[PDB]
Amino acid sequence: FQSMSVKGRIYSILKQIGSGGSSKVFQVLNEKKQIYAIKYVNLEEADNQTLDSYRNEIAYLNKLQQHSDKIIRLYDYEITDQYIYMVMECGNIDLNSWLKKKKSIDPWERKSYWKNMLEAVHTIHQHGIVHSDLKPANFLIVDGMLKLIDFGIANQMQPDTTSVVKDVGTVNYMPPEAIKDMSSKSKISPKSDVWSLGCILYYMTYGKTPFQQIINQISKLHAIIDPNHEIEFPDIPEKDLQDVLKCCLKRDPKQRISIPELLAHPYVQIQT
Numbered sequence: 001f002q003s004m005s006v007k008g009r010i011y012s013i014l015k016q017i018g019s020g021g022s023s024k025v026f027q028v029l030n031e032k033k034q035i036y037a038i039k040y041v042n043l044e045e046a047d048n049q050t051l052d053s054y055r056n057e058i059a060y061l062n063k064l065q066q067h068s069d070k071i072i073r074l075y076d077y078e079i080t081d082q083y084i085y086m087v088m089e090c091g092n093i094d095l096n097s098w099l100k101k102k103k104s105i106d107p108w109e110r111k112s113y114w115k116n117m118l119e120a121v122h123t124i125h126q127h128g129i130v131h132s133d134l135k136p137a138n139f140l141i142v143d144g145m146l147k148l149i150d151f152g153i154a155n156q157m158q159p160d161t162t163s164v165v166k167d168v169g170t171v172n173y174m175p176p177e178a179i180k181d182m183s184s185k186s187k188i189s190p191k192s193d194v195w196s197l198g199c200i201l202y203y204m205t206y207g208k209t210p211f212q213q214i215i216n217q218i219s220k221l222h223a224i225i226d227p228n229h230e231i232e233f234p235d236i237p238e239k240d241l242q243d244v245l246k247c248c249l250k251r252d253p254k255q256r257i258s259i260p261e262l263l264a265h266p267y268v269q270i271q272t
């Protein structure tokens with residue numbers, strides 16, 4: 001068994017939630033037997049670019065605490081030359097693990113989750129942050145409410161397993177312009193997050209991502225950028241939801257709907 005100290009407060013580790021690179025997230029208990037998640041970053045072999053990404057993520061997470069409750073709570077942190085400890089709320093489950101377990105999603109829960117994500121992403125955009133790598137794993141379900149966990153500034157972590165692993169990230173939420181930018185101008189804009197949000201909502205509507213069927217990677221990337229590749233939008237009773245999806249998944253970012261527009265859309269506004 002293991003334990004840890006953060007700004008003079010002791011926590012006992014229950015299990016490891018996730019890990020990625022020099023980072024680990026643990027489910028812990030304080031002295032009062034209250035649950036938290038602690039992200040541990042080992043900085044021993046970290047370069048100045050990796051260091052600055054962890055510093056920038058902490059500064060933005062702390063700054064944005066007061067601006068939205070759709071951003072994960074950061075209670076405390078410790079930073080030295082050797083490590084980082086971040087004390088956060090634990091939550092119930094990340095949105096990716098939740099979507100993989102769920103068979104059918106209630107239209108009211110899908111709508112409520114959509115509103116939470118728009119608000120979180122809108123808040124970061126207002127502070128000049130574009131995530132550019134949004135996936136369901138970036139969102140935490142905390143008592144039926146979605147909260148953005150990270151800002152895409154530091155390295156991404158994957159959930160851990162207690163079994164021996166056999167062989168990775170996802171390409172299913174990647175904007176078409178993120179692919180086109182690699183050969184070449186900034187390219188990136190708040191619209192890149194709209195596309196990724198659109199892929200998440202598409203998953204919550206049709207049970208798959210827009211290009212989940214394409215197993216091959218080079219053929220998937222081609223399909224995301226190809227204008228002749230028609231994305232299927234099967235008819236559903238929620239006509240407003242069908243329009244949101246079509247407007248989020250436009251290949252030209254200039255034609256793609258914005259976050260302020262999505263917040264005034266009937267899907268989010270009509271019937272509360």
Ligand SMILES: Cn1cc(-c2ccc(Nc3ccc(C#N)c(NC4CCCCC4)n3)cc2OCC#N)cn1
Nearest residue numbers: 018025027037039090091092093094097157158159
């Ligand atoms: C059945 N299941 C539950 C989870 C889960 C997943 C995440 C969290 N809480 C947090 C709280 C903070 C962070 C950070 N930073 C974080 N990161 C994970 C890393 C792996 C990918 C998902 C996000 N996860 C709590 C979670 O469950 C409650 C606990 N412990 C995953 N599968």
Ligand SMILES: [Mg+2]
Nearest residue numbers: 159160161162
């Ligand atoms: Mg598992």
Ligand SMILES: [Mg+2]
Nearest residue numbers: 161162163164
């Ligand atoms: Mg397993």
Ligand SMILES: [Mg+2]
Nearest residue numbers: 161162163164
């Ligand atoms: Mg297992």
